[PDB]
Each structure stands twice: as structure tokens, then as C-alpha cells.
Design a protein around this ligand. Structure first.
Ligand SMILES: *[C@@H](O)c1ccccc1N
Ligand SMILES: [Ca+2]
Ligand SMILES: [Ca+2]
Ligand SMILES: [Cl-]
Ligand SMILES: [Cu+]
Lengths: 14, 303
């Protein structure tokens, strides 16, 4: 639905 | 980039540094991709001719055994150890393992696992006793740069990575040509089946494979497609390389500032139905202190 994510970032979970 | 280290850089000879590396001669190649299904946000295009100076590049991603030797020699503490957690794919977390409630937006298959790091890749209770020659994972971009510098090396630029991964083919889809499984043979370790629910393991592996698995490409590099994402030196952007200039076409280093560093090659989790990012032109990024069970690196060197 949005661009597929292959790189999970530490910032993303805040 | 100006890193900081708490270990001295050891002296190494050219012959020592070059072991396990292939010499890529200076020349030009066609970088980028124009697949109509590419995600615009990824900036796979334009296709462009890039000239590179000669360089060396590792045939194999850095292995657990190699990273352990680095840690033994330096005492290096990885970002995942400092933070106390790293990302593990949900199917690889043993039931009962303590997990954080953290949510990667849009990617609920990632689990933040306290105590997951390079030597315990699924969290406390896991080990690498049976994976000495697998790519090291849970290594951040910082960790990769530290290893590479200790080793007398550096990370490849994205252009260097892609020239080497393309293995002497002009604008092929994959390192070996245009078919994913020519002659019905698996050529890389990616996902088969229904992502993220069931990996059939048809290619032999539902996690990382040894760094020497599958045939190499035409330059002798192994697992440039699939297995683990590989950190490159460049800051990420989707459009810096759309400019036509010496800076973007001769030994390009990427933009001077950014927030995430480039990763190339895809991993054991990639699948056509979701990311289709194991094509050699594909690209994504991650922030430099991040780490995950599907990301590692290979080194390059100036001869
Ligand atoms: C959303 O756009 C989406 C979701 C999953 C896989 C692909 C795409 N494009
Ligand atoms: Ca696989
Ligand atoms: Ca790879
Ligand atoms: Cl092994
Ligand atoms: Cu992917």
C-alpha cells in the first residue's frame, strides 16, 4: 500500500 | 565520514589485504535500472554510464569467523550490544524469548529482541556454533566501517558494489543474467512461498546460508544477490544520481549528507510479491546504527 520495507531502523519504532 | 575507534589500526601488507578479494579493473559500466515495476521512491534510475577507478572487492560477505577475530583482537562492542537489542524475523524467534512490544511501521514481521546480536542472532539462547562461515549479521553500518578499517579496507561505494555484483554483464536483471532460476537451478538465497507466512526453503535455506553458497558471478563474487543485505559507503538518496556531472558519473560517492546509508543485494527474506529487491539494480537504505538478522556487509579496498 506503501513502499515495501526491507530495512528496519531503530528510529522507526520510537 | 569521520569515525572514532578505541583500537589501533594494525599494519598489513598488500598481499594480506588482497586475500579473498578480486581485482576489478578500472573502466565503465551501466549502473541503475529501468524496470517499470520499480518503486519510484527507490531511485533505481536513471540507467547511466559510470566510470570507476580500479578497486578490490571481497568475494564473500564478511563471515562470523572473521568478525569474531576482529572482536577478539580489538574488544569492539557492536551497536546492537550497546542498545541491547536487534531486529529478528518473527519466525526465527523461539517461543518464550523475551521480546519488546516495538512495532516497525508497515513491517510487523520484524521483532525487536533484547539480547539479539551477532553472536546470538535470534536472541538469548541462540549461538553461531554451527554458522562460522555464514555472513555476520546484526552489524550496523558503524560496525561494518570499524571492521573494514581494522582489516585495512573500507566499504564499497554503491557504484563499486553494483559494478562488481553485475559481474561483467551489461544491464542484466541479476548477477548471472535475466532469469531467476536458469535451468531450474536456484542461484541465490531469497524467499520462496507466501511472504511473510511460510518460506518453503526451496533454495535450501530459510535463514542465512554460508557465504560461499551457490555459484559465483562472472567476477567470482558469491551471494551478491540474496542472503544478506550489504552496507555500502554512500548516504542514501533517491535522486542525487539523476544529475549528470563528474561527481555523479566518475567514482561517484553519493550525496555528502543524509540520514540513512545504502544497502544492496537483497536478503533471504526478499520475494517478488513484496519487495522484489534482489535484482542487482535494486537498492534501499537503513540508518547507520541499525542492525538486523538479514543485514551484513562485504569490504572493498584500494589497491
Ligand atoms: C502497497 O503498496 C504494497 C504492499 C505490499 C506489497 C507491495 C505493495 N506495493
Ligand atoms: Ca531461501
Ligand atoms: Ca546480498
Ligand atoms: Cl558454516
Ligand atoms: Cu527485500
Amino acid at each position: 500500500a506503501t513502499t515495501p520495507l526491507c530495512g528496519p531502523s531503530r528510529a522507526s519504532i520510537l | 565520514h569521520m569515525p572514532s575507534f578505541d583500537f589501533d589500526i594494525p599494519r598489513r601488507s598488500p598481499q594480506e589485504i588482497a586475500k579473498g578479494m578480486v581485482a576489478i579493473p578500472g573502466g565503465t559500466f551501466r549502473m541503475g535500472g529501468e524496470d517499470p515495476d520499480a518503486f519510484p521512491e527507490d531511485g533505481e534510475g536513471p540507467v547511466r554510464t559510470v566510470r570507476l577507478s580500479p578497486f578490490l572487492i571481497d568475494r564473500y560477505a564478511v563471515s562470523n569467523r572473521q568478525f569474531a577475530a576482529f572482536v577478539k583482537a580489538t574488544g569492539y562492542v557492536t551497536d546492537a550490544e550497546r542498545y541491547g537489542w536487534s531486529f529478528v524475523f518473527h519466525a526465527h524467534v523461539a517461543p518464550g524469548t523475551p521480546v519488546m512490544d516495538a512495532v516497525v511501521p508497515e513491517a510487523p514481521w520484524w521483532v525487536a529482541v533484547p539480547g539479539a546480536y551477532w553472536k546470538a542472532p535470534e536472541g538469548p539462547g541462540s549461538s553461531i556454533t554451527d554458522r562460522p562461515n555464514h555472513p555476520v549479521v546484526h552489524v550496523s553500518w558503524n560496525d561494518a566501517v570499524a571492521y573494514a578499517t581494522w582489516a585495512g579496507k573500507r566499504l564499497p561505494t554503491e557504484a563499486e558494489w553494483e559494478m562488481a555484483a553485475r559481474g561483467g554483464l551489461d544491464q542484466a536483471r541479476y548477477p548471472w543474467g535475466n532469469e531467476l532460476t536458469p535451468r531450474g537451478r536456484h542461484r541465490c538465497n531469497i524467499w520462496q512461498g507466501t511472504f511473510p507466512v511460510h518460506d518453503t526453503g526451496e533454495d535450501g535455506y530459510t535463514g542465512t546460508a554460508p557465504v560461499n553458497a551457490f555459484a559465483p558471478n562472472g567476477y567470482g563474487l558469491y551471494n551478491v544477490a540474496g542472503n544478506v543485505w550489504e552496507w555500502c559507503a554512500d548516504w542514501w538518496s533517491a535522486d542525487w544520481h539523476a544529475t549528470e556531472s563528474p561527481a555523479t558519473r566518475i567514482d561517484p560517492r553519493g550525496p555528502e549528507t543524509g540520514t540513512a546509508r545504502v544497502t544492496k543485494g537483497g536478503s533471504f527474506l526478499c520475494h517478488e510479491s513484496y519487495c522484489n529487491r534482489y535484482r542487482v539494480a535494486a537498492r534501499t537504505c537503513n540508518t547507520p546504527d541499525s542492525s538486523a538478522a538479514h543485514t551484513g556487509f562485504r569490504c572493498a579496498a584500494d589497491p
